[PDB]
Amino acid sequence: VDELGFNEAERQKILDSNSSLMRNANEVRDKFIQNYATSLKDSNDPQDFLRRVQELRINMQKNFISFDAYYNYLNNLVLASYNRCKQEKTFAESTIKNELTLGEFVAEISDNFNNFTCDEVARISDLVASYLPREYLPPFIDGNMMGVAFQILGIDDFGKKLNEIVQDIGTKYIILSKNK
């Protein structure tokens, strides 16, 4: 049937189904940045920058900013995607007699799983990274002080957690793609 291969329509269903955790994420980021992080640009010096980055983190906590939610959004999405492809995968192996044709569908299904999930993790990864707004960074800041700011703002730690999710996508890809 033509409802196999983890279709754009099936993919879109998992986006809308799971879209609540992401509601207004860019407007929230934009507004938080505008109200608390523009002054980073006026930092006097490297440690005054980091002092302002600490205060930014404190303002993030006081405003209940939380990356943990995006963590859950991705897990839910990945799971839901896995659950759809696994079902598709079964119904193809229950419905499709030519082994090579079945490969067609097993490869399409898992390749779209790998790509749909990995792109949503990158989108979320890019959004979380933007809470250290590049456009308000003082001209004297290097990659190393950005590194520390990433760590003080919670971004570095979110990255780790995002890495575990990409790792599970990779294992779910293994499962879903299991040769014929």
PDB file of N, CA, C and O in Angstrom, residues 104-176:
ATOM      1  N   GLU A 104      13.057  -2.393  -0.471  1.00  0.00           N
ATOM      2  CA  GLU A 104      12.738  -1.043  -0.910  1.00  0.00           C
ATOM      3  C   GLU A 104      12.051  -0.261   0.213  1.00  0.00           C
ATOM      4  O   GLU A 104      12.372   0.891   0.489  1.00  0.00           O
ATOM      5  N   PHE A 105      11.090  -0.935   0.836  1.00  0.00           N
ATOM      6  CA  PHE A 105      10.219  -0.294   1.815  1.00  0.00           C
ATOM      7  C   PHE A 105      10.905  -0.199   3.174  1.00  0.00           C
ATOM      8  O   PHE A 105      10.730   0.781   3.892  1.00  0.00           O
ATOM      9  N   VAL A 106      11.688  -1.217   3.515  1.00  0.00           N
ATOM     10  CA  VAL A 106      12.394  -1.203   4.796  1.00  0.00           C
ATOM     11  C   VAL A 106      13.473  -0.132   4.774  1.00  0.00           C
ATOM     12  O   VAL A 106      13.679   0.589   5.756  1.00  0.00           O
ATOM     13  N   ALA A 107      14.168   0.019   3.652  1.00  0.00           N
ATOM     14  CA  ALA A 107      15.152   1.085   3.523  1.00  0.00           C
ATOM     15  C   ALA A 107      14.514   2.474   3.518  1.00  0.00           C
ATOM     16  O   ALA A 107      15.041   3.406   4.127  1.00  0.00           O
ATOM     17  N   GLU A 108      13.388   2.647   2.834  1.00  0.00           N
ATOM     18  CA  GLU A 108      12.745   3.957   2.792  1.00  0.00           C
ATOM     19  C   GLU A 108      12.275   4.377   4.181  1.00  0.00           C
ATOM     20  O   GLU A 108      12.446   5.517   4.605  1.00  0.00           O
ATOM     21  N   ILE A 109      11.661   3.417   4.864  1.00  0.00           N
ATOM     22  CA  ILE A 109      11.050   3.657   6.160  1.00  0.00           C
ATOM     23  C   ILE A 109      12.082   4.069   7.202  1.00  0.00           C
ATOM     24  O   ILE A 109      11.883   5.013   7.965  1.00  0.00           O
ATOM     25  N   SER A 110      13.197   3.354   7.248  1.00  0.00           N
ATOM     26  CA  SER A 110      14.205   3.649   8.259  1.00  0.00           C
ATOM     27  C   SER A 110      15.009   4.895   7.909  1.00  0.00           C
ATOM     28  O   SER A 110      15.397   5.654   8.799  1.00  0.00           O
ATOM     29  N   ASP A 111      15.263   5.131   6.631  1.00  0.00           N
ATOM     30  CA  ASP A 111      15.974   6.304   6.147  1.00  0.00           C
ATOM     31  C   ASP A 111      15.163   7.572   6.419  1.00  0.00           C
ATOM     32  O   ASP A 111      15.733   8.630   6.664  1.00  0.00           O
ATOM     33  N   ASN A 112      13.835   7.465   6.369  1.00  0.00           N
ATOM     34  CA  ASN A 112      13.035   8.651   6.648  1.00  0.00           C
ATOM     35  C   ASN A 112      12.909   8.858   8.156  1.00  0.00           C
ATOM     36  O   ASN A 112      12.709   9.992   8.602  1.00  0.00           O
ATOM     37  N   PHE A 113      13.022   7.765   8.907  1.00  0.00           N
ATOM     38  CA  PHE A 113      13.057   7.835  10.368  1.00  0.00           C
ATOM     39  C   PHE A 113      14.357   8.531  10.775  1.00  0.00           C
ATOM     40  O   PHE A 113      14.367   9.458  11.585  1.00  0.00           O
ATOM     41  N   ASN A 114      15.463   8.065  10.194  1.00  0.00           N
ATOM     42  CA  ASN A 114      16.747   8.636  10.571  1.00  0.00           C
ATOM     43  C   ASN A 114      16.774  10.143  10.298  1.00  0.00           C
ATOM     44  O   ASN A 114      17.294  10.899  11.115  1.00  0.00           O
ATOM     45  N   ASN A 115      16.225  10.548   9.163  1.00  0.00           N
ATOM     46  CA  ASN A 115      16.300  11.915   8.673  1.00  0.00           C
ATOM     47  C   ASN A 115      15.304  12.854   9.321  1.00  0.00           C
ATOM     48  O   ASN A 115      15.605  14.022   9.623  1.00  0.00           O
ATOM     49  N   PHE A 116      14.093  12.341   9.541  1.00  0.00           N
ATOM     50  CA  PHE A 116      13.089  13.190  10.182  1.00  0.00           C
ATOM     51  C   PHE A 116      13.470  13.466  11.631  1.00  0.00           C
ATOM     52  O   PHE A 116      13.324  14.582  12.132  1.00  0.00           O
ATOM     53  N   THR A 117      13.973  12.448  12.339  1.00  0.00           N
ATOM     54  CA  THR A 117      14.277  12.647  13.749  1.00  0.00           C
ATOM     55  C   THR A 117      15.540  13.488  13.910  1.00  0.00           C
ATOM     56  O   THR A 117      15.536  14.416  14.722  1.00  0.00           O
ATOM     57  N   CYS A 118      16.564  13.140  13.143  1.00  0.00           N
ATOM     58  CA  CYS A 118      17.840  13.855  13.203  1.00  0.00           C
ATOM     59  C   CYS A 118      17.686  15.320  12.816  1.00  0.00           C
ATOM     60  O   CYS A 118      18.369  16.198  13.356  1.00  0.00           O
ATOM     61  N   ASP A 119      16.787  15.652  11.892  1.00  0.00           N
ATOM     62  CA  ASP A 119      16.583  17.060  11.565  1.00  0.00           C
ATOM     63  C   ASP A 119      15.842  17.751  12.697  1.00  0.00           C
ATOM     64  O   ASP A 119      16.048  18.929  12.984  1.00  0.00           O
ATOM     65  N   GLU A 120      14.935  17.038  13.378  1.00  0.00           N
ATOM     66  CA  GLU A 120      14.241  17.774  14.441  1.00  0.00           C
ATOM     67  C   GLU A 120      15.172  18.000  15.629  1.00  0.00           C
ATOM     68  O   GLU A 120      15.063  19.045  16.279  1.00  0.00           O
ATOM     69  N   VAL A 121      16.071  17.074  15.926  1.00  0.00           N
ATOM     70  CA  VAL A 121      17.071  17.271  16.974  1.00  0.00           C
ATOM     71  C   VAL A 121      18.006  18.431  16.640  1.00  0.00           C
ATOM     72  O   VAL A 121      18.392  19.212  17.512  1.00  0.00           O
ATOM     73  N   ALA A 122      18.405  18.600  15.384  1.00  0.00           N
ATOM     74  CA  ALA A 122      19.256  19.722  14.980  1.00  0.00           C
ATOM     75  C   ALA A 122      18.535  21.056  15.087  1.00  0.00           C
ATOM     76  O   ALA A 122      19.064  22.117  15.414  1.00  0.00           O
ATOM     77  N   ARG A 123      17.240  21.034  14.797  1.00  0.00           N
ATOM     78  CA  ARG A 123      16.490  22.279  14.906  1.00  0.00           C
ATOM     79  C   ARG A 123      16.424  22.718  16.364  1.00  0.00           C
ATOM     80  O   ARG A 123      16.626  23.871  16.740  1.00  0.00           O
ATOM     81  N   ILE A 124      16.113  21.746  17.226  1.00  0.00           N
ATOM     82  CA  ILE A 124      16.009  22.020  18.651  1.00  0.00           C
ATOM     83  C   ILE A 124      17.396  22.373  19.184  1.00  0.00           C
ATOM     84  O   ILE A 124      17.494  23.265  20.027  1.00  0.00           O
ATOM     85  N   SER A 125      18.415  21.671  18.678  1.00  0.00           N
ATOM     86  CA  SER A 125      19.771  21.989  19.106  1.00  0.00           C
ATOM     87  C   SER A 125      20.161  23.432  18.761  1.00  0.00           C
ATOM     88  O   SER A 125      20.717  24.146  19.601  1.00  0.00           O
ATOM     89  N   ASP A 126      19.868  23.866  17.546  1.00  0.00           N
ATOM     90  CA  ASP A 126      20.091  25.244  17.116  1.00  0.00           C
ATOM     91  C   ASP A 126      19.315  26.233  17.974  1.00  0.00           C
ATOM     92  O   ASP A 126      19.823  27.278  18.377  1.00  0.00           O
ATOM     93  N   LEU A 127      18.056  25.946  18.303  1.00  0.00           N
ATOM     94  CA  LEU A 127      17.316  26.864  19.159  1.00  0.00           C
ATOM     95  C   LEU A 127      17.942  26.990  20.540  1.00  0.00           C
ATOM     96  O   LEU A 127      18.040  28.077  21.106  1.00  0.00           O
ATOM     97  N   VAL A 128      18.377  25.874  21.124  1.00  0.00           N
ATOM     98  CA  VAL A 128      18.883  25.979  22.493  1.00  0.00           C
ATOM     99  C   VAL A 128      20.204  26.741  22.517  1.00  0.00           C
ATOM    100  O   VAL A 128      20.452  27.529  23.430  1.00  0.00           O
ATOM    101  N   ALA A 129      21.010  26.491  21.491  1.00  0.00           N
ATOM    102  CA  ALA A 129      22.264  27.184  21.335  1.00  0.00           C
ATOM    103  C   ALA A 129      22.034  28.693  21.188  1.00  0.00           C
ATOM    104  O   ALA A 129      22.872  29.479  21.639  1.00  0.00           O
ATOM    105  N   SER A 130      20.937  29.114  20.564  1.00  0.00           N
ATOM    106  CA  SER A 130      20.694  30.546  20.403  1.00  0.00           C
ATOM    107  C   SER A 130      20.361  31.286  21.684  1.00  0.00           C
ATOM    108  O   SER A 130      20.205  32.511  21.592  1.00  0.00           O
ATOM    109  N   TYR A 131      20.248  30.634  22.850  1.00  0.00           N
ATOM    110  CA  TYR A 131      20.090  31.355  24.129  1.00  0.00           C
ATOM    111  C   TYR A 131      21.374  32.024  24.609  1.00  0.00           C
ATOM    112  O   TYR A 131      21.435  32.791  25.576  1.00  0.00           O
ATOM    113  N   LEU A 132      22.491  31.750  23.948  1.00  0.00           N
ATOM    114  CA  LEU A 132      23.695  32.578  24.003  1.00  0.00           C
ATOM    115  C   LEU A 132      23.685  33.334  22.672  1.00  0.00           C
ATOM    116  O   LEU A 132      24.147  32.808  21.659  1.00  0.00           O
ATOM    117  N   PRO A 133      23.087  34.518  22.653  1.00  0.00           N
ATOM    118  CA  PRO A 133      22.754  35.129  21.364  1.00  0.00           C
ATOM    119  C   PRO A 133      24.029  35.675  20.733  1.00  0.00           C
ATOM    120  O   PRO A 133      24.699  36.552  21.263  1.00  0.00           O
ATOM    121  N   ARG A 134      24.381  35.145  19.574  1.00  0.00           N
ATOM    122  CA  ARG A 134      25.606  35.591  18.913  1.00  0.00           C
ATOM    123  C   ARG A 134      25.579  37.089  18.663  1.00  0.00           C
ATOM    124  O   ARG A 134      26.622  37.744  18.647  1.00  0.00           O
ATOM    125  N   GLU A 135      24.392  37.662  18.459  1.00  0.00           N
ATOM    126  CA  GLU A 135      24.429  39.076  18.076  1.00  0.00           C
ATOM    127  C   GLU A 135      24.689  40.022  19.245  1.00  0.00           C
ATOM    128  O   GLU A 135      24.850  41.213  18.943  1.00  0.00           O
ATOM    129  N   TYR A 136      24.756  39.583  20.497  1.00  0.00           N
ATOM    130  CA  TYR A 136      24.979  40.405  21.682  1.00  0.00           C
ATOM    131  C   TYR A 136      26.285  40.048  22.382  1.00  0.00           C
ATOM    132  O   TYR A 136      26.550  40.478  23.511  1.00  0.00           O
ATOM    133  N   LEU A 137      27.107  39.264  21.711  1.00  0.00           N
ATOM    134  CA  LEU A 137      28.415  38.862  22.224  1.00  0.00           C
ATOM    135  C   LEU A 137      29.444  39.977  22.045  1.00  0.00           C
ATOM    136  O   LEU A 137      29.615  40.425  20.906  1.00  0.00           O
ATOM    137  N   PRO A 138      30.124  40.396  23.103  1.00  0.00           N
ATOM    138  CA  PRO A 138      31.157  41.432  22.993  1.00  0.00           C
ATOM    139  C   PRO A 138      32.255  41.054  21.996  1.00  0.00           C
ATOM    140  O   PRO A 138      32.589  39.881  21.798  1.00  0.00           O
ATOM    141  N   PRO A 139      32.866  42.058  21.369  1.00  0.00           N
ATOM    142  CA  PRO A 139      33.793  41.799  20.264  1.00  0.00           C
ATOM    143  C   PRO A 139      35.064  41.101  20.730  1.00  0.00           C
ATOM    144  O   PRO A 139      35.816  40.530  19.948  1.00  0.00           O
ATOM    145  N   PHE A 140      35.330  41.124  22.030  1.00  0.00           N
ATOM    146  CA  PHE A 140      36.540  40.504  22.551  1.00  0.00           C
ATOM    147  C   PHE A 140      36.310  39.078  23.005  1.00  0.00           C
ATOM    148  O   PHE A 140      37.156  38.474  23.660  1.00  0.00           O
ATOM    149  N   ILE A 141      35.167  38.473  22.694  1.00  0.00           N
ATOM    150  CA  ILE A 141      34.973  37.111  23.223  1.00  0.00           C
ATOM    151  C   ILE A 141      35.441  36.041  22.255  1.00  0.00           C
ATOM    152  O   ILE A 141      35.137  36.059  21.066  1.00  0.00           O
ATOM    153  N   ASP A 142      36.215  35.070  22.738  1.00  0.00           N
ATOM    154  CA  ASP A 142      36.713  34.005  21.883  1.00  0.00           C
ATOM    155  C   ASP A 142      35.892  32.726  22.088  1.00  0.00           C
ATOM    156  O   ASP A 142      35.031  32.707  22.965  1.00  0.00           O
ATOM    157  N   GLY A 143      36.220  31.721  21.294  1.00  0.00           N
ATOM    158  CA  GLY A 143      35.597  30.413  21.323  1.00  0.00           C
ATOM    159  C   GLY A 143      35.701  29.791  22.699  1.00  0.00           C
ATOM    160  O   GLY A 143      34.908  28.947  23.095  1.00  0.00           O
ATOM    161  N   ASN A 144      36.700  30.199  23.481  1.00  0.00           N
ATOM    162  CA  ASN A 144      36.864  29.520  24.766  1.00  0.00           C
ATOM    163  C   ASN A 144      35.879  30.097  25.784  1.00  0.00           C
ATOM    164  O   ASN A 144      35.190  29.332  26.452  1.00  0.00           O
ATOM    165  N   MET A 145      35.831  31.414  25.882  1.00  0.00           N
ATOM    166  CA  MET A 145      34.864  32.076  26.752  1.00  0.00           C
ATOM    167  C   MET A 145      33.452  31.747  26.260  1.00  0.00           C
ATOM    168  O   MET A 145      32.559  31.652  27.098  1.00  0.00           O
ATOM    169  N   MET A 146      33.219  31.551  24.959  1.00  0.00           N
ATOM    170  CA  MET A 146      31.875  31.126  24.551  1.00  0.00           C
ATOM    171  C   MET A 146      31.597  29.744  25.141  1.00  0.00           C
ATOM    172  O   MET A 146      30.493  29.470  25.616  1.00  0.00           O
ATOM    173  N   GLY A 147      32.619  28.896  25.129  1.00  0.00           N
ATOM    174  CA  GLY A 147      32.511  27.552  25.687  1.00  0.00           C
ATOM    175  C   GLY A 147      32.030  27.587  27.124  1.00  0.00           C
ATOM    176  O   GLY A 147      31.060  26.915  27.506  1.00  0.00           O
ATOM    177  N   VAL A 148      32.706  28.402  27.937  1.00  0.00           N
ATOM    178  CA  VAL A 148      32.309  28.536  29.339  1.00  0.00           C
ATOM    179  C   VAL A 148      30.897  29.084  29.503  1.00  0.00           C
ATOM    180  O   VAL A 148      30.153  28.616  30.372  1.00  0.00           O
ATOM    181  N   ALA A 149      30.513  30.074  28.699  1.00  0.00           N
ATOM    182  CA  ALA A 149      29.180  30.672  28.720  1.00  0.00           C
ATOM    183  C   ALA A 149      28.175  29.583  28.357  1.00  0.00           C
ATOM    184  O   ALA A 149      27.123  29.483  28.977  1.00  0.00           O
ATOM    185  N   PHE A 150      28.505  28.751  27.372  1.00  0.00           N
ATOM    186  CA  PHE A 150      27.618  27.636  27.049  1.00  0.00           C
ATOM    187  C   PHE A 150      27.407  26.752  28.271  1.00  0.00           C
ATOM    188  O   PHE A 150      26.335  26.223  28.575  1.00  0.00           O
ATOM    189  N   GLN A 151      28.502  26.590  29.019  1.00  0.00           N
ATOM    190  CA  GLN A 151      28.386  25.696  30.179  1.00  0.00           C
ATOM    191  C   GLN A 151      27.586  26.404  31.258  1.00  0.00           C
ATOM    192  O   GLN A 151      26.699  25.817  31.878  1.00  0.00           O
ATOM    193  N   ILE A 152      27.865  27.687  31.497  1.00  0.00           N
ATOM    194  CA  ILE A 152      27.118  28.342  32.591  1.00  0.00           C
ATOM    195  C   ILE A 152      25.645  28.487  32.272  1.00  0.00           C
ATOM    196  O   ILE A 152      24.808  28.472  33.171  1.00  0.00           O
ATOM    197  N   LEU A 153      25.294  28.625  30.993  1.00  0.00           N
ATOM    198  CA  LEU A 153      23.882  28.780  30.645  1.00  0.00           C
ATOM    199  C   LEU A 153      23.116  27.481  30.557  1.00  0.00           C
ATOM    200  O   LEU A 153      21.904  27.491  30.286  1.00  0.00           O
ATOM    201  N   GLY A 154      23.757  26.340  30.782  1.00  0.00           N
ATOM    202  CA  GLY A 154      22.988  25.102  30.745  1.00  0.00           C
ATOM    203  C   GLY A 154      22.961  24.464  29.377  1.00  0.00           C
ATOM    204  O   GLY A 154      22.390  23.379  29.194  1.00  0.00           O
ATOM    205  N   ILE A 155      23.598  25.138  28.415  1.00  0.00           N
ATOM    206  CA  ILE A 155      23.489  24.682  27.026  1.00  0.00           C
ATOM    207  C   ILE A 155      24.361  23.464  26.786  1.00  0.00           C
ATOM    208  O   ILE A 155      23.979  22.453  26.179  1.00  0.00           O
ATOM    209  N   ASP A 156      25.574  23.537  27.324  1.00  0.00           N
ATOM    210  CA  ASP A 156      26.505  22.431  27.207  1.00  0.00           C
ATOM    211  C   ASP A 156      25.886  21.135  27.731  1.00  0.00           C
ATOM    212  O   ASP A 156      26.000  20.086  27.091  1.00  0.00           O
ATOM    213  N   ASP A 157      25.226  21.238  28.880  1.00  0.00           N
ATOM    214  CA  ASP A 157      24.635  20.066  29.512  1.00  0.00           C
ATOM    215  C   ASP A 157      23.442  19.545  28.715  1.00  0.00           C
ATOM    216  O   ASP A 157      23.160  18.339  28.693  1.00  0.00           O
ATOM    217  N   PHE A 158      22.731  20.456  28.050  1.00  0.00           N
ATOM    218  CA  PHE A 158      21.629  20.038  27.184  1.00  0.00           C
ATOM    219  C   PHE A 158      22.213  19.270  25.994  1.00  0.00           C
ATOM    220  O   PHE A 158      21.610  18.269  25.616  1.00  0.00           O
ATOM    221  N   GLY A 159      23.328  19.731  25.446  1.00  0.00           N
ATOM    222  CA  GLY A 159      24.024  19.112  24.319  1.00  0.00           C
ATOM    223  C   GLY A 159      24.311  17.650  24.653  1.00  0.00           C
ATOM    224  O   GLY A 159      23.963  16.768  23.862  1.00  0.00           O
ATOM    225  N   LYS A 160      24.903  17.382  25.814  1.00  0.00           N
ATOM    226  CA  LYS A 160      25.119  16.014  26.278  1.00  0.00           C
ATOM    227  C   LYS A 160      23.822  15.216  26.185  1.00  0.00           C
ATOM    228  O   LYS A 160      23.716  14.118  25.638  1.00  0.00           O
ATOM    229  N   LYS A 161      22.769  15.801  26.768  1.00  0.00           N
ATOM    230  CA  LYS A 161      21.516  15.042  26.764  1.00  0.00           C
ATOM    231  C   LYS A 161      21.035  14.849  25.335  1.00  0.00           C
ATOM    232  O   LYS A 161      20.435  13.817  25.008  1.00  0.00           O
ATOM    233  N   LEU A 162      21.309  15.823  24.463  1.00  0.00           N
ATOM    234  CA  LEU A 162      20.887  15.664  23.074  1.00  0.00           C
ATOM    235  C   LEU A 162      21.707  14.558  22.416  1.00  0.00           C
ATOM    236  O   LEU A 162      21.192  13.828  21.570  1.00  0.00           O
ATOM    237  N   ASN A 163      22.975  14.439  22.814  1.00  0.00           N
ATOM    238  CA  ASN A 163      23.833  13.398  22.269  1.00  0.00           C
ATOM    239  C   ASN A 163      23.307  11.999  22.580  1.00  0.00           C
ATOM    240  O   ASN A 163      23.389  11.123  21.717  1.00  0.00           O
ATOM    241  N   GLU A 164      22.792  11.765  23.777  1.00  0.00           N
ATOM    242  CA  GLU A 164      22.197  10.480  24.126  1.00  0.00           C
ATOM    243  C   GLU A 164      20.986  10.150  23.257  1.00  0.00           C
ATOM    244  O   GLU A 164      20.765   8.998  22.874  1.00  0.00           O
ATOM    245  N   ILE A 165      20.194  11.175  22.947  1.00  0.00           N
ATOM    246  CA  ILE A 165      19.046  10.979  22.065  1.00  0.00           C
ATOM    247  C   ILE A 165      19.485  10.621  20.648  1.00  0.00           C
ATOM    248  O   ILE A 165      18.948   9.700  20.032  1.00  0.00           O
ATOM    249  N   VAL A 166      20.463  11.331  20.097  1.00  0.00           N
ATOM    250  CA  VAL A 166      20.957  10.983  18.766  1.00  0.00           C
ATOM    251  C   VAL A 166      21.484   9.549  18.774  1.00  0.00           C
ATOM    252  O   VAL A 166      21.441   8.824  17.776  1.00  0.00           O
ATOM    253  N   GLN A 167      21.995   9.146  19.936  1.00  0.00           N
ATOM    254  CA  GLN A 167      22.582   7.817  20.070  1.00  0.00           C
ATOM    255  C   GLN A 167      21.489   6.755  20.032  1.00  0.00           C
ATOM    256  O   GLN A 167      21.671   5.680  19.466  1.00  0.00           O
ATOM    257  N   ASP A 168      20.355   7.090  20.641  1.00  0.00           N
ATOM    258  CA  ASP A 168      19.225   6.166  20.627  1.00  0.00           C
ATOM    259  C   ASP A 168      18.537   6.105  19.262  1.00  0.00           C
ATOM    260  O   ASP A 168      18.028   5.040  18.890  1.00  0.00           O
ATOM    261  N   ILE A 169      18.504   7.211  18.531  1.00  0.00           N
ATOM    262  CA  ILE A 169      17.992   7.273  17.166  1.00  0.00           C
ATOM    263  C   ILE A 169      18.782   6.294  16.294  1.00  0.00           C
ATOM    264  O   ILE A 169      18.177   5.560  15.510  1.00  0.00           O
ATOM    265  N   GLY A 170      20.102   6.314  16.488  1.00  0.00           N
ATOM    266  CA  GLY A 170      21.054   5.438  15.827  1.00  0.00           C
ATOM    267  C   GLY A 170      20.794   3.973  16.123  1.00  0.00           C
ATOM    268  O   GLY A 170      20.880   3.102  15.251  1.00  0.00           O
ATOM    269  N   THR A 171      20.450   3.672  17.375  1.00  0.00           N
ATOM    270  CA  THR A 171      20.068   2.313  17.743  1.00  0.00           C
ATOM    271  C   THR A 171      18.689   1.922  17.241  1.00  0.00           C
ATOM    272  O   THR A 171      18.418   0.751  16.959  1.00  0.00           O
ATOM    273  N   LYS A 172      17.804   2.914  17.139  1.00  0.00           N
ATOM    274  CA  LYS A 172      16.463   2.604  16.644  1.00  0.00           C
ATOM    275  C   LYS A 172      16.523   2.438  15.129  1.00  0.00           C
ATOM    276  O   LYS A 172      15.769   1.678  14.524  1.00  0.00           O
ATOM    277  N   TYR A 173      17.454   3.173  14.521  1.00  0.00           N
ATOM    278  CA  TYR A 173      17.697   3.039  13.093  1.00  0.00           C
ATOM    279  C   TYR A 173      18.186   1.618  12.797  1.00  0.00           C
ATOM    280  O   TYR A 173      17.737   1.006  11.834  1.00  0.00           O
ATOM    281  N   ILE A 174      19.122   1.160  13.621  1.00  0.00           N
ATOM    282  CA  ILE A 174      19.628  -0.206  13.507  1.00  0.00           C
ATOM    283  C   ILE A 174      18.446  -1.166  13.439  1.00  0.00           C
ATOM    284  O   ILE A 174      18.248  -1.906  12.484  1.00  0.00           O
ATOM    285  N   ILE A 175      17.646  -1.100  14.495  1.00  0.00           N
ATOM    286  CA  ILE A 175      16.479  -1.964  14.613  1.00  0.00           C
ATOM    287  C   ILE A 175      15.597  -1.887  13.374  1.00  0.00           C
ATOM    288  O   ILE A 175      15.316  -2.907  12.746  1.00  0.00           O
ATOM    289  N   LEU A 176      15.155  -0.691  13.012  1.00  0.00           N
ATOM    290  CA  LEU A 176      14.195  -0.511  11.936  1.00  0.00           C
ATOM    291  C   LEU A 176      14.743  -0.917  10.578  1.00  0.00           C
ATOM    292  O   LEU A 176      13.999  -1.244   9.650  1.00  0.00           O
TER     293      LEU A 176
END
